[PDB]
Ligand binder design. Structure first.
Ligand SMILES: COc1ccc(C(=O)n2c(C)c(Cc3ccccc3O[C@@H](C)C(=O)O)c3cc(OC(F)(F)F)ccc32)cc1
Ligand SMILES: COc1ccc(C(=O)n2c(C)c(Cc3ccccc3O[C@@H](C)C(=O)O)c3cc(OC(F)(F)F)ccc32)cc1
Lengths: 255, 253
């Protein structure tokens, strides 16, 4: 049964590597100056942003964020389908779980791209500083800061990709999403994923059941970040009428 | 090393029994009607509420919805003291920095209140006045504009949490784990807090393995419930923000 849980952990890690082209391993190699990977161009003000290439800045960056979130949804959906039992659930419930899980997973994976000083962009080819993002016209200057605050706390856990692979699967398989039809089979899958994560942490860390506990708490941080984020989106919708969310993102955010 | 985790589990149980008069065991017996004599007074509508006030010894008594909410506030202030007494019996707690003890309790009590409230609830209602009364879920659900959904999220949580079928033995260690959280804002010395919580978590794991040997997933499931509690609390304060100077002082939280 431990063996079943190890097999589940390995299946998930394999799918994660296959689904997500920029891993924490690669992000940390880029950020810490390892010779496996290359150095990013750093955008820290308006001039270096202009040089960054090769209708205002805040809006331009936001449309970029939108493009990469759309791709992330695609990657996460591919990953979700590999979680044993997911594709056998009622279709309505598959959609509900993805709708609520996608952004919580986005914030989780975004942390891998961040340190306290900024975030990797353009597949790790650029690095945009936290202070630059903060300087952006209101309320765009408020978007990324809560993500940074979360990322710094999440990254202190020092998880690697193999831990994250199971953690993300646990997120998607939440039986407490609004509007679910059959909660029991979702919870049955999550119970196994939770045990797989528990054992994975037990083998890989350091005070593992406490790490387990601290990691599970991050869900709450995640759902709070999402709530605060949609509120910001509502402001944007009202003040920037020449702008709207990509149809996929609109659908995710609808109710 | 298994023996000192059992010794710790036992100390916590004994202290939990001392601190909290109405145990889950006694509460479930009242809720199932296994208690052969003292059937609780049932509050299912406005008239039965008013009669309940006449018969039971209430200590908090203009509008029914306000009056019930005020009774809940009185009870919670009582519970904070019960929980505080319990916390001081957790090995290591009184040796923490004094500010940190205060900080752990400040953020910890509501999560514990919710956990313990679940012991008093079934899907149909909740025990009041140490089991002397029973207030139905539908009567609560029927209350005024903002007060009708005050208890619903507590019930929904309680129904799921009670499905784990924890007994007082399990809950004693579980509550100690919640209090000893190293991620509360403004903690000065997190290391010994997390050292104690690590020990409590190991004691909780063994306890669940011994008391529920047929459910290997229970520990994981319980830890996940710890996180639900923080969400419910956040949800509860956003409800409170929507909702006699000396009384304001007594009930500042
Ligand atoms: C889950 O997998 C992934 C998660 C994230 C990404 C990705 O790297 N990002 C992704 C998906 C984003 C966009 C983004 C991040 C967090 C929250 C929201 C968000 O986009 C908005 C439009 C949204 O989806 O509501 C992003 C932003 C970045 O910084 C910038 F400086 F540009 F603002 C940097 C990287 C970003 C790629 C894959
Ligand atoms: C931690 O130990 C205890 C935990 C709970 C109690 C307790 O039984 N209750 C306690 C503490 C309460 C009030 C209460 C419970 C959960 C969350 C909030 C709450 O009150 C509000 C006003 C608050 O504290 O902000 C309570 C309410 C009950 O239902 C009623 F019909 F009154 F609305 C019934 C029992 C209640 C006593 C001790």
């Amino acid at each position: 049964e431990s063996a079943d849980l190890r097999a589940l952990a390995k299946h998930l890690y394999d799918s994660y590597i296959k689904s997500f082209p920029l891993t924490k391993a690669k992000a940390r190699a880029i950020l810490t100056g390892k010779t496996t990977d290359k150095s990013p161009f750093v955008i820290y003000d308006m001039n270096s942003l202009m040089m960054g290439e090769d209708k205002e800045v805040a809006i331009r960056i936001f449309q970029g964020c939108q493009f990469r979130s759309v791709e992330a949804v695609q990657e996460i959906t591919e990953y979700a389908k590999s979680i044993p039992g997911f594709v056998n659930l009622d279709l309505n419930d598959q959609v509900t779980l993805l709708k609520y899980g996608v952004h919580e997973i986005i914030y989780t994976m975004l942390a891998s791209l961040m340190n306290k000083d900024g975030v990797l962009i353009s597949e790790g080819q650029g690095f945009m500083t936290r202070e630059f993002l903060k300087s952006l016209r209101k309320p765009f200057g408020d978007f990324m800061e809560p993500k940074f605050e979360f990322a710094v706390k999440f990254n202190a856990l020092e998880l690697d990709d193999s831990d994250l692979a199971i953690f993300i699967a646990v997120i998607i398989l939440s039986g407490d999403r609004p509007g679910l039809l059959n909660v029991k089979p979702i919870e049955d899958i999550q119970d196994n994923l939770l045990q797989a994560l528990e054992l994975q942490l037990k083998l890989n860390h350091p005070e593992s059941s406490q790490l387990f506990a601290k990691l599970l708490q991050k869900m709450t941080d995640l759902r709070q970040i999402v709530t605060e984020h949609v509120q910001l989106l509502q402001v944007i919708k009202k003040t920037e009428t020449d702008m709207s969310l990509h149809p996929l993102l609109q659908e995710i955010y609808k109710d």
